[PDB]
Amino acid sequence: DRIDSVSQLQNVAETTKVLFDVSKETVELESEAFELKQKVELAHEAKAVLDS
Amino acid sequence: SDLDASTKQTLVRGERLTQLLKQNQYSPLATEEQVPLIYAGVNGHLDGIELSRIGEFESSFLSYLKSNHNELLTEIREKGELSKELLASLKSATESFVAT
Amino acid sequence: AKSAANKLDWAKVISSLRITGSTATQLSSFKKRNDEARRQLLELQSQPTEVDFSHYRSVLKNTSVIDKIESYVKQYKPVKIDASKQLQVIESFEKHAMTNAKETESLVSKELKDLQSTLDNIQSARPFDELTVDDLTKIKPEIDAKVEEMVKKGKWDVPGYKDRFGNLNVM
């Protein structure tokens, strides 16, 4: 029974560290995307005023 | 009155499937998107999904599919025929979404 | 790219199912998914950044606003700077994480082989027929300790001896 618990934990220890890195890394890229959003926004507004 | 387990299973699926049919007026879904949703219920993935979360399941499932592999959807978009590989891949992928 | 991140993530969700912990895992998963999905909706939301003055300054007669917004868009065409800058503080979290990772890994590796040894040890050493009870005293002084305290106490009742061995009462 004890062996069963242990075997799970071995594989976990490495692979979980991968996810740890991965999650924060994606979030960083997504931060940079906000600057893109601002490009989208200003242009949309400009077309609208001009249409009026 | 009393419902046999065969009948009950159909009812549970049926009621939930009917929920799935419904759409928000004046906002239609893409053709590509309709294929997995129908896949899910038919292949019995939505059998277990509790009734309350069906709306969540739909949006989340679609977001999941795109994020995990919009490659599958691109394939089904062009092929327009669900290959055995795609069918299995989709079964696997849908099951993956069910888990989450 | 992002699909790699998610493949390892969801593999880890169903792995994390099989180990203890999930208290703040789901909140982390929710957060990376949230902004990633926000960015996907962004990336589909994006229309060209530019006023199409090809036709729209070729139909406006209430002019002198097309040049204004042309200049406003092309002015702020440099939008505010990139948000890559967390990689020292992000790296630090990874250090802390690494410390913990290595601790778990080395511990369980040690324990696994210890348990293999323990199973083997039970099979080849164990008085599974019989052995001298003096040898049991030799392998554990706990025997003599409990006996001595009972002899000192004067109790000859052994608590629960009669509920997991007989007592052969003739009364």
PDB file of all heavy atoms in Angstrom, chain B residues 42-89, unseen atoms left out:
ATOM      1  N   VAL B  42     -23.877  12.733 -28.603  1.00  0.00           N
ATOM      2  CA  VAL B  42     -24.131  11.510 -29.328  1.00  0.00           C
ATOM      3  C   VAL B  42     -23.241  10.418 -28.823  1.00  0.00           C
ATOM      4  O   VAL B  42     -23.691   9.301 -28.580  1.00  0.00           O
ATOM      5  N   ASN B  43     -21.958  10.750 -28.575  1.00  0.00           N
ATOM      6  CA  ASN B  43     -20.970   9.797 -28.140  1.00  0.00           C
ATOM      7  C   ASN B  43     -21.026   9.685 -26.644  1.00  0.00           C
ATOM      8  O   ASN B  43     -20.246   8.962 -26.035  1.00  0.00           O
ATOM      9  N   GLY B  44     -22.041  10.319 -26.027  1.00  0.00           N
ATOM     10  CA  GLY B  44     -22.481  10.010 -24.700  1.00  0.00           C
ATOM     11  C   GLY B  44     -21.652  10.661 -23.659  1.00  0.00           C
ATOM     12  O   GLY B  44     -21.674  10.276 -22.495  1.00  0.00           O
ATOM     13  N   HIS B  45     -20.933  11.722 -24.044  1.00  0.00           N
ATOM     14  CA  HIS B  45     -20.008  12.405 -23.190  1.00  0.00           C
ATOM     15  C   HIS B  45     -20.783  13.338 -22.297  1.00  0.00           C
ATOM     16  O   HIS B  45     -20.378  13.605 -21.170  1.00  0.00           O
ATOM     17  N   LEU B  46     -21.982  13.765 -22.761  1.00  0.00           N
ATOM     18  CA  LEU B  46     -22.822  14.723 -22.085  1.00  0.00           C
ATOM     19  C   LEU B  46     -23.835  13.950 -21.274  1.00  0.00           C
ATOM     20  O   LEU B  46     -24.763  14.524 -20.711  1.00  0.00           O
ATOM     21  N   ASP B  47     -23.763  12.600 -21.280  1.00  0.00           N
ATOM     22  CA  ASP B  47     -24.632  11.778 -20.466  1.00  0.00           C
ATOM     23  C   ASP B  47     -24.444  12.068 -19.011  1.00  0.00           C
ATOM     24  O   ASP B  47     -25.420  12.185 -18.274  1.00  0.00           O
ATOM     25  N   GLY B  48     -23.177  12.210 -18.575  1.00  0.00           N
ATOM     26  CA  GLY B  48     -22.866  12.347 -17.180  1.00  0.00           C
ATOM     27  C   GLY B  48     -22.993  13.753 -16.699  1.00  0.00           C
ATOM     28  O   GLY B  48     -23.302  13.968 -15.531  1.00  0.00           O
ATOM     29  N   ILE B  49     -22.686  14.739 -17.576  1.00  0.00           N
ATOM     30  CA  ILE B  49     -22.694  16.157 -17.282  1.00  0.00           C
ATOM     31  C   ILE B  49     -23.976  16.562 -16.618  1.00  0.00           C
ATOM     32  O   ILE B  49     -25.048  16.346 -17.166  1.00  0.00           O
ATOM     33  N   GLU B  50     -23.889  17.110 -15.382  1.00  0.00           N
ATOM     34  CA  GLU B  50     -25.041  17.534 -14.629  1.00  0.00           C
ATOM     35  C   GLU B  50     -25.711  18.681 -15.319  1.00  0.00           C
ATOM     36  O   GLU B  50     -25.052  19.506 -15.950  1.00  0.00           O
ATOM     37  N   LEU B  51     -27.060  18.711 -15.226  1.00  0.00           N
ATOM     38  CA  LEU B  51     -27.944  19.528 -16.021  1.00  0.00           C
ATOM     39  C   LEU B  51     -27.625  20.987 -15.884  1.00  0.00           C
ATOM     40  O   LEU B  51     -27.600  21.723 -16.867  1.00  0.00           O
ATOM     41  N   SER B  52     -27.281  21.413 -14.653  1.00  0.00           N
ATOM     42  CA  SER B  52     -26.993  22.779 -14.319  1.00  0.00           C
ATOM     43  C   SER B  52     -25.832  23.329 -15.116  1.00  0.00           C
ATOM     44  O   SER B  52     -25.837  24.497 -15.491  1.00  0.00           O
ATOM     45  N   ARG B  53     -24.800  22.505 -15.386  1.00  0.00           N
ATOM     46  CA  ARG B  53     -23.586  22.980 -15.997  1.00  0.00           C
ATOM     47  C   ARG B  53     -23.578  22.820 -17.493  1.00  0.00           C
ATOM     48  O   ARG B  53     -22.531  23.008 -18.096  1.00  0.00           O
ATOM     49  N   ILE B  54     -24.711  22.518 -18.169  1.00  0.00           N
ATOM     50  CA  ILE B  54     -24.684  22.249 -19.598  1.00  0.00           C
ATOM     51  C   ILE B  54     -24.213  23.441 -20.390  1.00  0.00           C
ATOM     52  O   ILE B  54     -23.400  23.308 -21.303  1.00  0.00           O
ATOM     53  N   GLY B  55     -24.656  24.658 -20.004  1.00  0.00           N
ATOM     54  CA  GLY B  55     -24.279  25.869 -20.691  1.00  0.00           C
ATOM     55  C   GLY B  55     -22.809  26.115 -20.586  1.00  0.00           C
ATOM     56  O   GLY B  55     -22.143  26.455 -21.563  1.00  0.00           O
ATOM     57  N   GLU B  56     -22.258  25.842 -19.385  1.00  0.00           N
ATOM     58  CA  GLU B  56     -20.857  25.975 -19.102  1.00  0.00           C
ATOM     59  C   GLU B  56     -20.087  25.021 -19.952  1.00  0.00           C
ATOM     60  O   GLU B  56     -19.082  25.399 -20.546  1.00  0.00           O
ATOM     61  N   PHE B  57     -20.611  23.777 -20.097  1.00  0.00           N
ATOM     62  CA  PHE B  57     -19.969  22.686 -20.778  1.00  0.00           C
ATOM     63  C   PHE B  57     -19.744  23.096 -22.186  1.00  0.00           C
ATOM     64  O   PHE B  57     -18.637  22.956 -22.677  1.00  0.00           O
ATOM     65  N   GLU B  58     -20.749  23.752 -22.807  1.00  0.00           N
ATOM     66  CA  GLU B  58     -20.666  24.092 -24.199  1.00  0.00           C
ATOM     67  C   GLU B  58     -19.552  25.058 -24.464  1.00  0.00           C
ATOM     68  O   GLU B  58     -18.675  24.796 -25.283  1.00  0.00           O
ATOM     69  N   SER B  59     -19.509  26.163 -23.689  1.00  0.00           N
ATOM     70  CA  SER B  59     -18.561  27.218 -23.941  1.00  0.00           C
ATOM     71  C   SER B  59     -17.170  26.752 -23.655  1.00  0.00           C
ATOM     72  O   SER B  59     -16.253  26.935 -24.451  1.00  0.00           O
ATOM     73  N   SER B  60     -17.027  26.058 -22.515  1.00  0.00           N
ATOM     74  CA  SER B  60     -15.781  25.562 -22.017  1.00  0.00           C
ATOM     75  C   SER B  60     -15.237  24.513 -22.926  1.00  0.00           C
ATOM     76  O   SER B  60     -14.054  24.525 -23.226  1.00  0.00           O
ATOM     77  N   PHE B  61     -16.111  23.640 -23.470  1.00  0.00           N
ATOM     78  CA  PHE B  61     -15.743  22.578 -24.368  1.00  0.00           C
ATOM     79  C   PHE B  61     -15.161  23.171 -25.612  1.00  0.00           C
ATOM     80  O   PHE B  61     -14.097  22.761 -26.053  1.00  0.00           O
ATOM     81  N   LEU B  62     -15.814  24.214 -26.165  1.00  0.00           N
ATOM     82  CA  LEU B  62     -15.353  24.832 -27.382  1.00  0.00           C
ATOM     83  C   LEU B  62     -14.044  25.533 -27.173  1.00  0.00           C
ATOM     84  O   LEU B  62     -13.143  25.432 -27.998  1.00  0.00           O
ATOM     85  N   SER B  63     -13.897  26.240 -26.031  1.00  0.00           N
ATOM     86  CA  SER B  63     -12.681  26.943 -25.702  1.00  0.00           C
ATOM     87  C   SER B  63     -11.554  25.977 -25.534  1.00  0.00           C
ATOM     88  O   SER B  63     -10.455  26.212 -26.022  1.00  0.00           O
ATOM     89  N   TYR B  64     -11.864  24.817 -24.913  1.00  0.00           N
ATOM     90  CA  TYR B  64     -10.957  23.738 -24.645  1.00  0.00           C
ATOM     91  C   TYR B  64     -10.448  23.212 -25.939  1.00  0.00           C
ATOM     92  O   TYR B  64      -9.247  23.083 -26.114  1.00  0.00           O
ATOM     93  N   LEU B  65     -11.358  22.992 -26.914  1.00  0.00           N
ATOM     94  CA  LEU B  65     -11.022  22.351 -28.153  1.00  0.00           C
ATOM     95  C   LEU B  65     -10.080  23.218 -28.901  1.00  0.00           C
ATOM     96  O   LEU B  65      -9.060  22.742 -29.362  1.00  0.00           O
ATOM     97  N   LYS B  66     -10.356  24.535 -28.949  1.00  0.00           N
ATOM     98  CA  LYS B  66      -9.505  25.460 -29.634  1.00  0.00           C
ATOM     99  C   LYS B  66      -8.151  25.569 -28.999  1.00  0.00           C
ATOM    100  O   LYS B  66      -7.140  25.612 -29.692  1.00  0.00           O
ATOM    101  N   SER B  67      -8.106  25.671 -27.654  1.00  0.00           N
ATOM    102  CA  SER B  67      -6.869  25.830 -26.933  1.00  0.00           C
ATOM    103  C   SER B  67      -6.005  24.602 -26.969  1.00  0.00           C
ATOM    104  O   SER B  67      -4.792  24.709 -27.124  1.00  0.00           O
ATOM    105  N   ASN B  68      -6.603  23.408 -26.773  1.00  0.00           N
ATOM    106  CA  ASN B  68      -5.915  22.145 -26.798  1.00  0.00           C
ATOM    107  C   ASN B  68      -5.456  21.837 -28.193  1.00  0.00           C
ATOM    108  O   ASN B  68      -4.304  21.475 -28.401  1.00  0.00           O
ATOM    109  N   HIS B  69      -6.338  22.006 -29.187  1.00  0.00           N
ATOM    110  CA  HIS B  69      -6.016  21.642 -30.530  1.00  0.00           C
ATOM    111  C   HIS B  69      -7.127  22.107 -31.393  1.00  0.00           C
ATOM    112  O   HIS B  69      -8.142  21.442 -31.580  1.00  0.00           O
ATOM    113  N   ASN B  70      -6.893  23.255 -32.054  1.00  0.00           N
ATOM    114  CA  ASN B  70      -7.848  23.841 -32.952  1.00  0.00           C
ATOM    115  C   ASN B  70      -7.529  23.209 -34.286  1.00  0.00           C
ATOM    116  O   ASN B  70      -8.287  23.330 -35.239  1.00  0.00           O
ATOM    117  N   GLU B  71      -6.438  22.403 -34.313  1.00  0.00           N
ATOM    118  CA  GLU B  71      -5.939  21.629 -35.408  1.00  0.00           C
ATOM    119  C   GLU B  71      -6.978  20.640 -35.810  1.00  0.00           C
ATOM    120  O   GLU B  71      -7.263  20.505 -36.992  1.00  0.00           O
ATOM    121  N   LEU B  72      -7.648  20.006 -34.816  1.00  0.00           N
ATOM    122  CA  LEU B  72      -8.685  19.039 -35.063  1.00  0.00           C
ATOM    123  C   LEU B  72      -9.809  19.708 -35.785  1.00  0.00           C
ATOM    124  O   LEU B  72     -10.297  19.205 -36.787  1.00  0.00           O
ATOM    125  N   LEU B  73     -10.203  20.903 -35.303  1.00  0.00           N
ATOM    126  CA  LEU B  73     -11.314  21.632 -35.842  1.00  0.00           C
ATOM    127  C   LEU B  73     -11.020  22.129 -37.227  1.00  0.00           C
ATOM    128  O   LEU B  73     -11.920  22.195 -38.051  1.00  0.00           O
ATOM    129  N   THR B  74      -9.759  22.531 -37.502  1.00  0.00           N
ATOM    130  CA  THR B  74      -9.300  22.921 -38.815  1.00  0.00           C
ATOM    131  C   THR B  74      -9.399  21.774 -39.777  1.00  0.00           C
ATOM    132  O   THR B  74      -9.796  21.951 -40.924  1.00  0.00           O
ATOM    133  N   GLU B  75      -9.026  20.560 -39.323  1.00  0.00           N
ATOM    134  CA  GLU B  75      -9.130  19.360 -40.106  1.00  0.00           C
ATOM    135  C   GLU B  75     -10.549  19.058 -40.443  1.00  0.00           C
ATOM    136  O   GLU B  75     -10.855  18.813 -41.596  1.00  0.00           O
ATOM    137  N   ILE B  76     -11.472  19.129 -39.467  1.00  0.00           N
ATOM    138  CA  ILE B  76     -12.859  18.812 -39.693  1.00  0.00           C
ATOM    139  C   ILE B  76     -13.477  19.896 -40.543  1.00  0.00           C
ATOM    140  O   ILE B  76     -14.418  19.654 -41.290  1.00  0.00           O
ATOM    141  N   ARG B  77     -12.922  21.122 -40.478  1.00  0.00           N
ATOM    142  CA  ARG B  77     -13.308  22.237 -41.296  1.00  0.00           C
ATOM    143  C   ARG B  77     -13.031  22.036 -42.732  1.00  0.00           C
ATOM    144  O   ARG B  77     -13.759  22.569 -43.562  1.00  0.00           O
ATOM    145  N   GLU B  78     -11.908  21.386 -43.064  1.00  0.00           N
ATOM    146  CA  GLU B  78     -11.569  21.239 -44.444  1.00  0.00           C
ATOM    147  C   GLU B  78     -12.058  19.923 -44.929  1.00  0.00           C
ATOM    148  O   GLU B  78     -12.700  19.865 -45.971  1.00  0.00           O
ATOM    149  N   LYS B  79     -11.792  18.833 -44.194  1.00  0.00           N
ATOM    150  CA  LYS B  79     -12.184  17.512 -44.599  1.00  0.00           C
ATOM    151  C   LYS B  79     -13.662  17.364 -44.701  1.00  0.00           C
ATOM    152  O   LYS B  79     -14.153  16.821 -45.684  1.00  0.00           O
ATOM    153  N   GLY B  80     -14.417  17.855 -43.694  1.00  0.00           N
ATOM    154  CA  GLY B  80     -15.862  17.894 -43.751  1.00  0.00           C
ATOM    155  C   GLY B  80     -16.440  16.507 -43.654  1.00  0.00           C
ATOM    156  O   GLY B  80     -17.602  16.268 -43.969  1.00  0.00           O
ATOM    157  N   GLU B  81     -15.602  15.570 -43.184  1.00  0.00           N
ATOM    158  CA  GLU B  81     -15.885  14.177 -43.080  1.00  0.00           C
ATOM    159  C   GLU B  81     -15.082  13.874 -41.865  1.00  0.00           C
ATOM    160  O   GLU B  81     -13.962  14.366 -41.729  1.00  0.00           O
ATOM    161  N   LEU B  82     -15.623  13.040 -40.958  1.00  0.00           N
ATOM    162  CA  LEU B  82     -14.965  12.735 -39.717  1.00  0.00           C
ATOM    163  C   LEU B  82     -14.318  11.411 -39.974  1.00  0.00           C
ATOM    164  O   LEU B  82     -15.004  10.406 -40.134  1.00  0.00           O
ATOM    165  N   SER B  83     -12.967  11.393 -40.097  1.00  0.00           N
ATOM    166  CA  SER B  83     -12.209  10.183 -40.317  1.00  0.00           C
ATOM    167  C   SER B  83     -12.185   9.389 -39.049  1.00  0.00           C
ATOM    168  O   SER B  83     -12.548   9.895 -37.998  1.00  0.00           O
ATOM    169  N   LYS B  84     -11.804   8.098 -39.132  1.00  0.00           N
ATOM    170  CA  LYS B  84     -11.755   7.202 -38.003  1.00  0.00           C
ATOM    171  C   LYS B  84     -10.762   7.690 -36.998  1.00  0.00           C
ATOM    172  O   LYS B  84     -11.018   7.663 -35.797  1.00  0.00           O
ATOM    173  N   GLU B  85      -9.614   8.199 -37.497  1.00  0.00           N
ATOM    174  CA  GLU B  85      -8.611   8.815 -36.676  1.00  0.00           C
ATOM    175  C   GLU B  85      -9.134  10.038 -35.986  1.00  0.00           C
ATOM    176  O   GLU B  85      -8.963  10.176 -34.783  1.00  0.00           O
ATOM    177  N   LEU B  86      -9.852  10.920 -36.716  1.00  0.00           N
ATOM    178  CA  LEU B  86     -10.463  12.099 -36.152  1.00  0.00           C
ATOM    179  C   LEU B  86     -11.507  11.768 -35.146  1.00  0.00           C
ATOM    180  O   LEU B  86     -11.681  12.498 -34.182  1.00  0.00           O
ATOM    181  N   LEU B  87     -12.286  10.702 -35.402  1.00  0.00           N
ATOM    182  CA  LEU B  87     -13.341  10.253 -34.548  1.00  0.00           C
ATOM    183  C   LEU B  87     -12.765   9.786 -33.263  1.00  0.00           C
ATOM    184  O   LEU B  87     -13.242  10.179 -32.207  1.00  0.00           O
ATOM    185  N   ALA B  88     -11.675   8.991 -33.313  1.00  0.00           N
ATOM    186  CA  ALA B  88     -11.047   8.515 -32.109  1.00  0.00           C
ATOM    187  C   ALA B  88     -10.406   9.633 -31.338  1.00  0.00           C
ATOM    188  O   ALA B  88     -10.591   9.746 -30.131  1.00  0.00           O
ATOM    189  N   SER B  89      -9.723  10.547 -32.063  1.00  0.00           N
ATOM    190  CA  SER B  89      -9.022  11.680 -31.515  1.00  0.00           C
ATOM    191  C   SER B  89      -9.953  12.604 -30.815  1.00  0.00           C
ATOM    192  O   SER B  89      -9.610  13.215 -29.810  1.00  0.00           O
TER     193      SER B  89
END
